[PDB]
Amino acid sequence: RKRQAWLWEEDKNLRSGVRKYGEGNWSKILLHYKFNNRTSVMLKDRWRTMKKLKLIS
DNA sequence: GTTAGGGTTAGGG
DNA sequence: CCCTAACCCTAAC
């Protein structure tokens, strides 16, 4: 079962989540907007890798 | 349960 | 063996 690579549905939705409900508020983001099967851990570590190299918030 | 960084597994090069 | 990245662990909140 090949590991799922995040798509813009998830990532673009996440970016919206960060802007509309704050970055470090993955709970709120998960409540407001749905994803395939993500957690606070997933969302945060995704955004972590992203900002670490690209620097967005 | 969530949050936050450390760190391994998966993926591709 | 390196980079980016999804998963997984340790630690703290």
Side-chain angles (χ1 to χ4, degrees), chain A residues 2 5-6 9 22-24 32 35-36 39 41-42 45 47 56:
Chain A
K2 169 166 283 301
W6 286 53
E9 187 172 272
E23 190 178 83
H32 295 303
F35 295 79
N36 179 32
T39 68
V41 179
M42 298 294 92
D45 71 46
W47 198 260
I56 292 104

Side-chain angles (χ1 to χ4, degrees), chain A residues 13-29:
Chain A
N13 176 54
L14 177 58
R15 184 159 186 169
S16 267
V18 167
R19 179 146 287 186
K20 282 83 176 178
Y21 317 118
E23 190 178 83
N25 296 269
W26 330 101
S27 53
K28 301 208 302 257
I29 294 170

